[PDB]
Amino acid sequence: GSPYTIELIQPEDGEAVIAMLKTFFFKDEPLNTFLDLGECKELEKYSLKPLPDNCSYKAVNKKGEIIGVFLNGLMRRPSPCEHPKFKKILSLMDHVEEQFNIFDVYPDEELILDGKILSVDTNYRGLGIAGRLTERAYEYMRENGINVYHVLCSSHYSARVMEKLGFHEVFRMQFADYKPQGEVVFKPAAPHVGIQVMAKEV
Ligand SMILES: CC(C)(COP(=O)(O)OP(=O)(O)OC[C@H]1O[C@@H](n2cnc3c(N)ncnc32)[C@H](O)[C@@H]1OP(=O)(O)O)[C@@H](O)C(=O)NCCC(=O)NCCS
Ligand SMILES: [NH3+]CCc1ccccc1
């Protein structure tokens, strides 16, 4: 009996979204937790960047507070940062993109939807809000003729959200195996075993 709405995130929402992410995602996404991310303007800018694509969604409670967000942006088929902790995360994301091209799985797709930042207020977890946020994007995909939803998960819990919705894990990289320059960079808490790249054909 905790009602909420699912709404498109507007440009004026940037501040509220960042406030929520700082309380939750910035502290409790597993890589951020492992590194103890702290203040990070670069992740703020990173989070705001896809908003103008108009396919990022917020869950809002009966008090008008944001209790969940899924920030998404369009991702195109490829063709030929001072914050020292976020730099490591960014390098990991570059690395995955170097080792796995989602577009090889979908050779006839030019544009796909990329699920970038997913966060739900701890008090409201286990109610399927992340799933509701994810499904909302299907409406956008259908309107725009987008066929694939790609979500790189750094959490076993977000991977579970995607699995319930019928996403399949098309690439796994275990953190224990990520050793750029020969040494382990990340050792997040179990059950977060690795990067789980999830894809749905909607
Ligand atoms: C990942 C996250 C967005 C899921 O949101 P959610 O709305 O709770 O999603 P769900 O209700 O489907 O729960 C997913 C799974 O989380 C697990 N979970 C972790 N903590 C939980 C808790 N406090 N309450 C209930 N379930 C929890 C459960 O295994 C659950 O599976 P199940 O309910 O089907 O048995 C949320 O856990 C979160 O914000 N985590 C921290 C930030 C993060 O890791 N983001 C994703 C990085 S890719
Ligand atoms: N998709 C999750 C990856 C991630 C982890 C931490 C900061 C930004 C992005």
Curated annotation (Swiss-Prot):
Keyword set includes Nucleotidyltransferase: no
Report keywords, A-Z. Acyltransferase, Cytoplasm, Melatonin biosynthesis, Nucleus, Transferase
Thermal dependence of activity, per record: Optimum temperature is 37 degrees Celsius. Retains 84% of activity when incubated at 4 degrees Celsius for 3 days.
Q: Which residue positions does UniProt flag as site: Acetyl-CoA?
A: K164
N-acetyltransferase domain residues: 118-191
- Site positions (Has a role in the catalytic activity): E29, S154, S158
**Annotated effect of mutating Y178F:** No effect on the catalytic activity towards tryptamine
- Phenotype of gene-disrupted mutants: Has a darker body color. Shows ectopic pigmentation in the wing hinge, the posterior pupal case, leg joints and cuticular sutures. RNAi-mediated knockdown in astrocytes, does not affect numbers of astrocytes present in the brain. Shows normal baseline patterns and amounts of daytime and nighttime sleep, but while awake are less active. Upon overnight mechanical sleep deprivation, results in increased recovery sleep next day. RNAi-mediated knockdown in neurons results in normal patterns of baseline sleep. Shows lower levels of activity while awake during daytime.
Q: Does the keyword Nuclease apply?
A: no
In the record, the note on similarity to other proteins reads: Belongs to the acetyltransferase family. AANAT subfamily.
The name on file for this protein is Arylalkylamine N-acetyltransferase 1
High-level lineage: Eukaryota, Metazoa, Ecdysozoa, Arthropoda, Hexapoda
Portion of the parent chain present: 56 to 265 of 275
